[PDB]
Protein backbone atom coordinates (compact mmCIF):
# COMPACT_ATOMS: atom_id res chain seq x y z
CA UNK A 77 0.00 0.00 0.00
CA UNK A 78 0.92 3.66 0.49
CA UNK A 79 3.79 2.77 2.83
CA UNK A 80 5.33 0.54 0.14
CA UNK A 81 4.68 3.02 -2.68
CA UNK A 82 6.37 5.68 -0.53
CA UNK A 83 9.41 3.42 -0.15
CA UNK A 84 9.68 3.01 -3.91
CA UNK A 85 9.61 6.80 -4.35
CA UNK A 86 12.36 7.38 -1.79
CA UNK A 87 14.42 4.70 -3.58
CA UNK A 88 14.11 6.51 -6.92
CA UNK A 89 14.98 9.82 -5.27
CA UNK A 90 18.46 8.65 -4.20
CA UNK A 91 19.40 7.57 -7.72
CA UNK A 92 18.27 10.95 -9.04
CA UNK A 93 20.90 12.83 -7.02
CA UNK A 94 23.68 10.63 -8.45
CA UNK A 95 22.90 11.58 -12.08
CA UNK A 96 23.47 15.29 -11.57
CA UNK A 97 27.04 14.67 -12.74
CA UNK A 98 25.80 12.64 -15.72
CA UNK A 99 23.42 15.46 -16.70
CA UNK A 100 26.46 17.74 -16.76
CA UNK A 101 28.19 15.50 -19.30
CA UNK A 102 25.03 15.49 -21.41
CA UNK A 103 24.66 19.26 -21.28
CA UNK A 104 28.34 19.56 -22.24
CA UNK A 105 27.96 17.45 -25.37
CA UNK A 106 24.55 18.90 -26.26
CA UNK A 107 25.79 22.50 -26.18
CA UNK A 108 28.80 21.55 -28.30
CA UNK A 109 26.50 19.97 -30.89
CA UNK A 110 24.06 22.91 -30.90
CA UNK A 111 27.05 25.13 -31.58
CA UNK A 112 28.35 23.22 -34.59
CA UNK A 113 24.81 22.76 -35.90
CA UNK A 114 24.23 26.54 -35.77
CA UNK A 115 27.21 26.92 -38.09
CA UNK A 116 25.24 25.07 -40.80
CA UNK A 117 23.24 27.17 -43.25
CA UNK A 118 20.29 24.78 -42.96
CA UNK A 119 20.24 24.38 -39.16
CA UNK A 120 21.15 28.00 -38.36
CA UNK A 121 18.12 28.59 -36.18
CA UNK A 122 18.30 25.27 -34.36
CA UNK A 123 17.84 25.41 -30.61
CA UNK A 124 17.18 23.38 -27.51
CA UNK A 125 13.55 22.68 -26.66
CA UNK A 126 12.73 23.14 -22.96
CA UNK A 127 10.83 20.01 -21.90
CA UNK A 128 11.80 19.72 -18.20
CA UNK A 129 15.01 14.61 -19.49
CA UNK A 130 13.93 10.99 -18.69
CA UNK A 131 11.54 8.67 -20.52
CA UNK A 132 13.09 5.90 -18.34
CA UNK A 133 13.19 6.48 -14.56
CA UNK A 134 14.42 2.93 -13.88
CA UNK A 135 17.45 3.72 -16.09
CA UNK A 136 18.79 7.02 -14.72
CA UNK A 137 21.62 7.03 -17.29
CA UNK A 138 19.39 7.22 -20.40
CA UNK A 139 18.58 10.81 -21.44
CA UNK A 140 16.15 12.34 -23.95
CA UNK A 141 16.74 15.68 -25.70
CA UNK A 142 14.76 17.55 -28.35
CA UNK A 143 16.19 20.14 -30.75
CA UNK A 144 13.69 22.49 -32.34
CA UNK A 145 13.96 24.26 -35.70
CA UNK A 146 11.52 27.08 -36.43
CA UNK A 147 10.03 26.91 -39.96
CA UNK A 148 8.00 30.07 -40.62
CA UNK A 149 5.33 30.30 -43.30
CA UNK A 150 4.66 26.59 -43.00
CA UNK A 151 1.74 24.92 -44.77
CA UNK A 152 0.50 21.61 -43.34
CA UNK A 153 -1.48 18.96 -45.18
CA UNK A 154 -3.06 16.15 -43.18
CA UNK A 155 -2.11 12.65 -44.35
CA UNK A 156 -5.25 10.60 -45.09
CA UNK A 157 -7.54 11.48 -42.22
CA UNK A 158 -5.04 10.30 -39.63
CA UNK A 159 -5.32 13.58 -37.70
CA UNK A 160 -1.81 13.25 -36.29
CA UNK A 161 0.40 13.02 -39.43
CA UNK A 162 1.04 15.80 -41.91
CA UNK A 163 2.95 16.71 -45.00
CA UNK A 164 4.98 19.91 -44.63
CA UNK A 165 4.89 22.40 -47.55
CA UNK A 166 6.02 26.02 -47.89
CA UNK A 167 8.91 33.62 -54.08
CA UNK A 168 12.34 33.63 -52.44
CA UNK A 169 14.20 30.40 -51.66
CA UNK A 170 15.91 29.65 -48.34
CA UNK A 171 18.41 27.02 -47.08
CA UNK A 172 15.61 24.61 -46.16
CA UNK A 173 14.92 23.98 -49.85
CA UNK A 174 17.88 21.60 -49.81
CA UNK A 175 15.52 19.26 -47.88
CA UNK A 176 12.65 19.44 -50.36
CA UNK A 177 11.53 16.31 -52.22
CA UNK A 178 9.21 17.82 -54.77
CA UNK A 179 7.11 20.41 -52.99
CA UNK A 180 7.20 18.75 -49.54
CA UNK A 181 9.72 18.85 -46.71
CA UNK A 182 11.61 15.54 -46.53
CA UNK A 183 12.38 14.22 -43.06
CA UNK A 184 14.91 11.75 -44.55
CA UNK A 185 16.96 14.46 -46.24
CA UNK A 186 16.91 16.59 -43.12
CA UNK A 187 17.77 13.69 -40.81
CA UNK A 188 20.60 12.65 -43.09
CA UNK A 189 22.34 16.03 -42.94
CA UNK A 190 21.56 16.23 -39.22
CA UNK A 191 23.25 12.85 -38.67
CA UNK A 192 26.28 13.62 -40.86
CA UNK A 193 26.98 16.78 -38.86
CA UNK A 194 26.67 15.20 -35.42
CA UNK A 195 28.74 12.17 -36.45
CA UNK A 196 31.42 14.55 -37.77
CA UNK A 197 31.38 16.66 -34.62
CA UNK A 198 31.29 13.66 -32.27
CA UNK A 199 34.62 12.55 -33.77
CA UNK A 200 36.06 16.03 -33.31
CA UNK A 201 35.38 15.98 -29.57
CA UNK A 202 38.52 15.22 -27.52
CA UNK A 203 37.62 16.41 -23.98
CA UNK A 204 35.37 13.37 -23.35
CA UNK A 205 34.67 10.01 -24.99
CA UNK A 206 31.40 9.90 -26.92
CA UNK A 207 30.30 7.33 -29.51
CA UNK A 208 27.36 7.33 -31.89
CA UNK A 209 25.00 4.34 -32.06
CA UNK A 210 23.37 2.75 -35.10
CA UNK A 211 20.10 4.01 -36.61
CA UNK A 212 14.25 4.99 -35.63
CA UNK A 213 14.45 8.72 -36.49
CA UNK A 214 16.35 9.98 -33.44
CA UNK A 215 20.16 10.14 -33.00
CA UNK A 216 21.61 8.24 -30.04
CA UNK A 217 24.99 8.87 -28.40
CA UNK A 218 26.93 7.03 -25.71
CA UNK A 219 28.94 9.17 -23.28
CA UNK A 220 31.51 7.21 -21.24
CA UNK A 221 30.26 3.62 -21.05
CA UNK A 222 26.99 4.20 -19.22
CA UNK A 223 25.32 7.45 -20.29
CA UNK A 224 23.21 7.52 -23.43
CA UNK A 225 21.43 10.43 -25.07
CA UNK A 226 18.58 10.33 -27.60
CA UNK A 227 18.38 13.52 -29.67
CA UNK A 228 15.20 14.19 -31.61
CA UNK A 229 14.90 17.00 -34.15
CA UNK A 230 11.52 18.77 -34.30
CA UNK A 231 10.04 21.46 -36.53
CA UNK A 232 8.48 24.32 -34.59
CA UNK A 233 5.47 26.35 -35.73
CA UNK A 234 4.40 29.46 -33.85
CA UNK A 235 1.11 29.59 -35.73
CA UNK A 236 -2.28 28.41 -34.53
CA UNK A 237 -2.59 24.74 -33.51
CA UNK A 238 -3.93 22.44 -36.25
CA UNK A 239 -7.65 21.91 -36.47
CA UNK A 240 -7.59 18.30 -35.28
CA UNK A 241 -6.65 19.49 -31.77
CA UNK A 242 -9.70 21.72 -31.47
CA UNK A 243 -11.58 19.50 -28.98
CA UNK A 244 -8.47 18.39 -27.08
CA UNK A 245 -6.53 19.58 -24.07
CA UNK A 246 -9.81 19.43 -22.16
CA UNK A 247 -8.39 20.82 -18.92
CA UNK A 248 -11.04 23.53 -18.30
CA UNK A 249 -12.59 21.73 -15.32
CA UNK A 250 -9.23 21.22 -13.61
CA UNK A 251 -6.97 24.15 -14.50
CA UNK A 252 -9.65 26.52 -16.02
CA UNK A 253 -10.41 27.59 -19.59
CA UNK A 254 -8.02 30.53 -19.52
CA UNK A 255 -5.11 28.22 -18.82
CA UNK A 256 -6.17 26.09 -21.78
CA UNK A 257 -6.29 29.26 -23.91
CA UNK A 258 -2.81 30.21 -22.72
CA UNK A 259 -1.34 26.79 -23.42
CA UNK A 260 -2.87 26.78 -26.91
CA UNK A 261 -1.01 30.03 -27.66
CA UNK A 262 2.28 28.19 -27.31
CA UNK A 263 3.91 26.81 -30.47
CA UNK A 264 3.44 23.28 -31.66
CA UNK A 265 5.98 20.82 -32.99
CA UNK A 266 6.36 18.22 -35.70
CA UNK A 267 8.71 15.26 -35.53
CA UNK A 268 9.77 12.68 -38.10
CA UNK A 269 7.96 9.40 -37.65
CA UNK A 270 9.37 5.87 -37.43
CA UNK A 271 9.51 3.38 -40.24
CA UNK A 272 7.76 1.29 -37.57
CA UNK A 273 4.76 3.63 -37.18
CA UNK A 274 2.45 4.46 -40.08
CA UNK A 275 2.61 3.14 -43.64
CA UNK A 276 8.55 4.82 -46.04
CA UNK A 277 6.52 8.07 -46.26
CA UNK A 278 7.65 11.67 -45.65
CA UNK A 279 4.92 12.52 -43.15
CA UNK A 280 5.54 14.34 -39.88
CA UNK A 281 3.73 13.81 -36.57
CA UNK A 282 2.31 16.42 -34.22
CA UNK A 283 4.30 16.76 -31.02
CA UNK A 284 3.32 18.57 -27.82
CA UNK A 285 6.19 17.36 -25.64
CA UNK A 286 6.60 20.86 -24.23
CA UNK A 287 3.17 20.82 -22.58
CA UNK A 288 3.70 18.24 -19.81
CA UNK A 289 6.23 20.55 -18.14
CA UNK A 290 3.72 23.44 -18.16
CA UNK A 291 1.09 21.33 -16.45
CA UNK A 292 3.33 19.44 -14.02
CA UNK A 293 4.77 22.75 -12.77
CA UNK A 294 1.30 24.25 -12.23
CA UNK A 295 -0.78 21.14 -11.61
CA UNK A 296 -3.29 22.00 -8.93
CA UNK A 297 -6.71 23.39 -9.01
CA UNK A 298 -5.13 25.52 -6.26
CA UNK A 299 -2.59 28.07 -7.46
CA UNK A 300 -0.49 27.18 -4.36
CA UNK A 301 -0.76 23.39 -4.65
CA UNK A 302 2.48 21.83 -3.35
CA UNK A 303 3.79 25.25 -2.28
CA UNK A 304 3.22 25.01 1.50
CA UNK A 305 2.88 22.47 4.32
CA UNK A 306 -0.95 22.23 4.15
CA UNK A 307 -1.23 21.57 0.37
CA UNK A 308 0.81 18.48 -0.45
CA UNK A 309 -0.71 16.43 -3.31
CA UNK A 310 0.48 13.20 -4.92
CA UNK A 311 -0.06 13.87 -8.63
CA UNK A 312 3.64 13.85 -9.51
CA UNK A 313 4.20 10.73 -7.43
CA UNK A 314 1.33 8.87 -9.10
CA UNK A 315 2.62 9.67 -12.58
CA UNK A 316 6.07 8.47 -11.46
CA UNK A 317 4.63 5.20 -10.10
CA UNK A 318 2.57 4.61 -13.25
CA UNK A 319 5.68 5.16 -15.39
CA UNK A 320 7.79 2.85 -13.22
CA UNK A 321 5.10 0.14 -13.28
CA UNK A 322 5.13 -0.02 -17.07
CA UNK A 323 8.93 0.14 -17.24
CA UNK A 324 9.23 -2.72 -14.74
CA UNK A 325 6.61 -4.82 -16.57
CA UNK A 326 8.31 -4.29 -19.95
CA UNK A 327 11.65 -5.37 -18.44
CA UNK A 328 10.06 -8.47 -16.88
CA UNK A 329 8.76 -9.48 -20.33
CA UNK A 330 11.50 -8.15 -22.63
CA UNK A 331 11.90 -11.65 -24.15
CA UNK A 332 8.29 -11.67 -25.37
CA UNK A 333 7.17 -9.10 -27.90
CA UNK A 334 3.79 -8.59 -26.23
CA UNK A 335 4.62 -5.20 -24.64
CA UNK A 336 6.85 -3.56 -27.26
CA UNK A 337 4.04 -1.20 -28.34
CA UNK A 338 3.30 0.27 -24.88
CA UNK A 339 5.29 3.34 -23.86
CA UNK A 340 5.28 6.22 -21.41
CA UNK A 341 2.98 8.06 -23.85
CA UNK A 342 0.12 5.75 -22.94
CA UNK A 343 0.75 5.99 -19.20
CA UNK A 344 1.01 9.80 -19.33
CA UNK A 345 -2.10 10.18 -21.47
CA UNK A 346 -3.98 7.90 -19.06
CA UNK A 347 -2.65 9.82 -16.06
CA UNK A 348 -3.70 13.23 -17.36
CA UNK A 349 -7.16 11.88 -18.19
CA UNK A 350 -7.49 10.83 -14.54
CA UNK A 351 -6.39 14.35 -13.53
CA UNK A 352 -9.17 15.70 -15.74
CA UNK A 353 -11.68 13.32 -14.23
CA UNK A 354 -10.55 14.09 -10.62
CA UNK A 355 -9.88 17.84 -10.74
CA UNK A 356 -9.99 18.59 -7.01
CA UNK A 357 -6.76 18.83 -5.08
CA UNK A 358 -8.53 16.93 -2.31
CA UNK A 359 -8.74 13.92 -4.65
CA UNK A 360 -4.93 13.83 -4.63
CA UNK A 361 -4.12 14.26 -0.95
CA UNK A 362 -0.62 13.00 -0.09
CA UNK A 363 -2.08 10.87 2.72
CA UNK A 364 -4.15 8.93 0.15
CA UNK A 365 -1.20 7.88 -2.04
CA UNK A 366 -2.40 4.26 -2.09
CA UNK A 367 -5.96 5.13 -3.12
CA UNK A 368 -4.82 7.73 -5.66
CA UNK A 369 -2.47 5.27 -7.35
CA UNK A 370 -5.20 2.59 -7.38
CA UNK A 371 -7.42 5.04 -9.24
CA UNK A 372 -4.69 5.56 -11.83
CA UNK A 373 -4.25 1.81 -12.17
CA UNK A 374 -7.94 0.98 -12.49
CA UNK A 375 -8.45 3.77 -15.05
CA UNK A 376 -5.62 2.36 -17.14
CA UNK A 377 -7.13 -1.12 -16.89
CA UNK A 378 -10.51 0.19 -18.10
CA UNK A 379 -8.81 1.78 -21.11
CA UNK A 380 -7.17 -1.56 -21.84
CA UNK A 381 -10.36 -3.60 -21.63
CA UNK A 382 -12.44 -1.22 -23.74
CA UNK A 383 -9.50 -0.62 -26.16
CA UNK A 384 -9.96 3.15 -25.81
CA UNK A 385 -7.30 5.69 -24.83
CA UNK A 386 -7.94 9.06 -26.48
CA UNK A 387 -4.86 11.07 -27.25
CA UNK A 388 -4.96 14.12 -25.02
CA UNK A 389 -4.60 16.69 -27.77
CA UNK A 390 -6.35 14.89 -30.61
CA UNK A 391 -9.28 13.02 -29.03
CA UNK A 392 -10.30 11.47 -32.36
CA UNK A 393 -7.03 9.46 -32.26
CA UNK A 394 -7.31 6.25 -30.24
CA UNK A 395 -3.91 5.19 -28.93
CA UNK A 396 -5.40 1.78 -28.03
CA UNK A 397 -7.04 1.22 -31.43
CA UNK A 398 -6.69 -2.38 -32.54
CA UNK A 399 -5.27 -0.81 -35.71
CA UNK A 400 -2.24 0.06 -33.52
CA UNK A 401 -1.98 -2.57 -30.74
CA UNK A 402 -3.66 -5.91 -31.32
CA UNK A 403 -6.32 -7.12 -28.91
CA UNK A 404 -4.13 -9.90 -27.52
CA UNK A 405 -1.42 -7.50 -26.30
CA UNK A 406 -3.82 -5.34 -24.32
CA UNK A 407 -5.39 -8.45 -22.79
CA UNK A 408 -1.92 -9.59 -21.71
CA UNK A 409 -0.97 -6.29 -20.09
CA UNK A 410 -4.40 -6.30 -18.41
CA UNK A 411 -3.61 -9.70 -16.90
CA UNK A 412 -0.22 -8.58 -15.63
CA UNK A 413 -1.49 -5.31 -14.16
CA UNK A 414 -4.44 -7.07 -12.52
CA UNK A 415 -2.00 -9.54 -10.97
CA UNK A 416 0.21 -6.70 -9.72
CA UNK A 417 -2.70 -4.77 -8.19
CA UNK A 418 -4.10 -7.91 -6.53
CA UNK A 419 -0.74 -8.73 -4.91
CA UNK A 420 0.22 -5.22 -3.70
CA UNK A 421 2.59 -4.72 -6.66
CA UNK A 422 5.44 -7.19 -6.10
CA UNK A 423 7.05 -5.73 -9.21
CA UNK A 424 7.95 -2.77 -6.98
CA UNK A 425 10.03 -4.19 -4.13
CA UNK A 426 13.82 -4.55 -4.09
Ligand SMILES: O=c1cc(CNc2ccccc2F)[nH]c2nc(NCc3ccccc3Cl)nn12
Pocket residue numbers: 159160281282283284285286287288291341344345346348349387388389390393
Ligand atom coordinates in the same frame (compact mmCIF):
# COMPACT_ATOMS: atom_id res chain seq x y z
O1 LIG B 1 4.45 14.99 -26.46
C1 LIG B 1 3.41 14.39 -26.21
C2 LIG B 1 3.05 13.82 -24.98
C3 LIG B 1 1.87 13.16 -24.78
C4 LIG B 1 1.61 12.57 -23.43
N1 LIG B 1 0.41 13.06 -22.81
C5 LIG B 1 0.27 14.31 -22.31
C6 LIG B 1 1.28 15.27 -22.36
C7 LIG B 1 1.07 16.53 -21.83
C8 LIG B 1 -0.15 16.86 -21.27
C9 LIG B 1 -1.17 15.92 -21.22
C10 LIG B 1 -0.93 14.67 -21.72
F1 LIG B 1 -1.90 13.73 -21.67
N2 LIG B 1 0.96 13.05 -25.80
C11 LIG B 1 1.25 13.58 -27.02
N3 LIG B 1 0.52 13.57 -28.13
C12 LIG B 1 1.33 14.25 -28.99
N4 LIG B 1 0.92 14.49 -30.33
C13 LIG B 1 -0.31 13.92 -30.88
C14 LIG B 1 -0.02 12.46 -31.19
C15 LIG B 1 1.24 11.91 -30.95
C16 LIG B 1 1.51 10.58 -31.20
C17 LIG B 1 0.53 9.76 -31.72
C18 LIG B 1 -0.73 10.27 -31.98
C19 LIG B 1 -1.00 11.60 -31.72
CL1 LIG B 1 -2.58 12.18 -32.04
N5 LIG B 1 2.49 14.67 -28.51
N6 LIG B 1 2.42 14.21 -27.21
Ligand SMILES: [Zn+2]
Pocket residue numbers: 295296301302307308309310311
Ligand atom coordinates in the same frame (compact mmCIF):
# COMPACT_ATOMS: atom_id res chain seq x y z
ZN1 LIG C 1 0.25 19.50 -5.86
